[PDB]
Amino acid sequence: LLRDVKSRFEKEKSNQAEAQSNIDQGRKKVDALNKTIAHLEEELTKEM
Amino acid sequence: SKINERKNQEQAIASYEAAKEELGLKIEQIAQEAQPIKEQYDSTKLAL
Amino acid sequence: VEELTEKCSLKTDEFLKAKEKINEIFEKLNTIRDEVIKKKNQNEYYRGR
């Protein structure tokens, strides 16, 4: 019972760590895309 | 098109963040319930 | 008799060391089995994913 509950807790903690890593990867990718769109949106639109 | 891609990616990131917060509460309660099981296992091992 | 006391003490020390070592080996085998079961749970969760 301890082994299964500890395995479940460790799997949940691994899922939490994976969710944190996925959030970090998604946020870095979205930040890179936001930087590219921020560089391209104001390339010529600001003057207009 | 890039704003729409960023918006759906941000929505996915927000869903992942909400899942992270709820899963963190769930793991916290699971650990709190699991600790008495570990204590009972230790007491049973000592008695055995 | 002092030699017998030293011999009994060393035999008890060797018995304790052998029992501790076999128990530690059994516990290490149990921990390895637990780690393999945890890896199997990770593998089955990865298969589910």
Q: For residue C40, what are its two tokens?
A: 């199997």
Contact A16, B23 (CB under 8 A): yes
> Measured between alpha carbons, how far is residue C46 from residues C31, C36, C41 in Å?
22, 15, 8
Q: For residue A35, what are its two tokens?
A: 């930087």
> Which of B5, B24, B34 is closest, CB to CB, to A16?
B24
Contact A22, B37 (CB under 8 A): no
CA C23, CA C25: separation in Å to the nearest integer? Answer: 5
> Measured between alpha carbons, how far is residue A15 from residues A28, B32, C6, C33, C48 in Å?
19, 18, 57, 22, 13
Mutate to test the interface with A, among C35, C40, C41 (most CBs of A within 10 A): C41
Exposure of A34 by Cβ count < 10 A (0-12 exposed, 13-18 middle, 19+ buried)? middle
Q: Which residues are CB-contacts of A7 (< 8 A; sequence separation ≥ 6)? A: C37, C38, C41
Determined by: cryo-EM
Torsion sign (Cα): A47, A31, C49, C43:
positive
Distance between A48 CA and the closest CA of chain C, angstroms: 49
Nearest to A30 by CA among A20, A42, A22: A22
Cβ contact C–A (≥3 pairs, < 8 Å): yes
Cβ contact B–C (≥3 pairs, < 8 Å): no
